[PDB]
Amino acid sequence: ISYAAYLNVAAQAIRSTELQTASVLNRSQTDAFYTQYKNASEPTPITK
Amino acid sequence: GEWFRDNGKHALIVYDDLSKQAVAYRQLSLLLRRPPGREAYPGDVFYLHSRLLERAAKLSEKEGSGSLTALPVIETQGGDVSAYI
Amino acid sequence: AEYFRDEEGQDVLLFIDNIFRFTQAGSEVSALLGRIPSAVGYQPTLATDMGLLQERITTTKKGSVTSVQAVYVPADDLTDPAPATTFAHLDATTVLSRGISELGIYPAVDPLDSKSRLLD
Amino acid sequence: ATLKEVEMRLKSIKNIEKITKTMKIVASTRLSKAEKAKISAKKMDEAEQLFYKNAETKNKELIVAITSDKGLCGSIHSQLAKAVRRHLNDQPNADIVTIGDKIKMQLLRTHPNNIKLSINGIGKDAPTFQESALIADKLLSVMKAGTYPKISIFYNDPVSSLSFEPSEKPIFNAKTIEQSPSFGKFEIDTDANVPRDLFEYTLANQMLTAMAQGYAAEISARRNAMDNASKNAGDMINRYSILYNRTRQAVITNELVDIITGASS
């Protein structure tokens, strides 16, 4: 597990007295997908 | 065509092109000095085209079976379908 | 042309420049002649005159005359009755358009408006 | 007809005009938020650059590229493509990771050999740490980023609020961090694997910045493009208006002639 990925999961957990904003929620929710490729050839666009 | 139809034989008449028929009647009419209609085609141009075309039919079983089928062909001047002809 | 075509029985050529002028001349005389003028001013005898002219240019079982006829499209509207009735009686046409001239292409032949019966 | 065919075509041009106006305006609205974000992001980045500068640097290659999924963001898509293609000459066999559909299309066409990773769901969103982190994680695992002794990322630097110059930068490998001239003026701890961590940390931190710079240029480009579109549409409005006017006069005259001819009889 990469260091910045490690920090990332911690950051996601961290968006949970309370004081909540949209930019935070957006910073912790993404709908992006990553499409693996080979050759041309394309293994699927697995959700990021 | 009507002789085929009347005899009970089915047939088809291609009237290519009625647009030049209209020009012919136009010449004829304008030198008989009949009142000239829009686009220099008198009013009975509609009557002319209608009477010509309406003689295509599929006769009743009683009255034989022959059907004259018509395919008129109109060549549009620039695709202007609002033109009188 | 007919003398060469028929009597001399040799292949010929004929050039007419412009056959719009043939049409044009007729419309001018027509009014004076006494005919009620047809739409876009043309003589009511436009169809017959065009007919006679274009069936006297036809290539007999005698001579073979390649003919080239040049229509000065009036105001450049092809829909005008004079070019329109000409279009019927020519085996191939190569309409040359002012727009294509503007594009700088010399010769100014429109490439989407050319046809020949022998294109097949 | 001339008259109706002119009129309907002019209406089409009108509708096109209206849409291009609308898009340009909405783009301006979107652009303000985008720009605000990019400042804050850039401030974070500069602190990281402060280390890399003072340390010095002294680094096959990796290519990462950034554009939106979204189209009609001007010539961002193809100007960036051209500068990638130029550096695809430089290192032939390099594996291109295309972050964004638009850059994916141009490069994929020019060499379909190199496409190994490509992303999706980029353009719609404004870049966030979450995206960058996951992409980074996938670059490390999938592309084995350290293996390429050069790493380069391409993005669009938003030169002016009306311009964009496509730009690239080199990400320094973990090897680089080790052998950088100064690295001992900062107190390295052998206990931590600070190169192996910092490499990863700056992989994402730099990439996020690249995405932010790019995103601002993209939204800026769309605004610029849609503005120029309105202008082009305006020219066509004028051209068809003149046509309409001419056609209108002609219809009156031609109709009049028919009436007169009839009256004459």
Verbal overview:
The structure is cut from a larger assembly and holds chains A (48 residues), B (85 residues), C (120 residues) and D (265 residues). Chain A is an alpha+beta fold. Chain A has helices at 3-14, 22-26, and strands at residues 33-36, 45-47. Chain A has a two-stranded antiparallel ribbon. In chain A, strand 1 and strand 2 form a beta hairpin. The two termini of chain A are 15 Å apart. Chain B is an alpha+beta fold and 85 residues long. Chain B has helices at residues 2-6, 18-30, 45-53; strands spanning 11-15, 57-58, 67-72. The longest helix of chain B has 13 residues, at 18-30. The two termini of chain C are 29 Å apart. The longest helix of chain C is centred in the N-terminal third of the chain and has 14 residues, at 20-33. In chain C, the strands form 2 sheets. Chain C has a two-stranded parallel sheet with strand order 1-2. Chain C has a two-stranded antiparallel sheet with strand order 3-4. Chain C has helices at residues 2-8, 20-33, 46-54, 81-87, 98-102; strands spanning 12-17, 65-70, 92-96, 109-116. In chain D, helix 4 (129-143) crosses helix 6. Chain D has helices spanning 3-54, 76-90, 101-110, 129-143, 174-179, 194-264, and strands at 62-66, 95-99, 115-120, 151-160, 163-171. By secondary structure, chain D is α/β, with parallel strands linked by helices. Chain D has 2 domains: 1-25 and 226-265, ATP synthase, gamma subunit, helix hairpin domain (Helix Hairpins), CATH 1.10.287; 26-225, ATP synthase, F1 complex, gamma subunit (Pyruvate Kinase, Chain: A, domain 1), CATH 3.40.1380. Chains in contact: A-D, B-C, B-D, C-D. At the C-D interface, loops of C face helix 6 of D. Strand 1 (33-36) of chain A pairs antiparallel with strand 3 (115-120) of chain D, so a sheet runs across the interface.
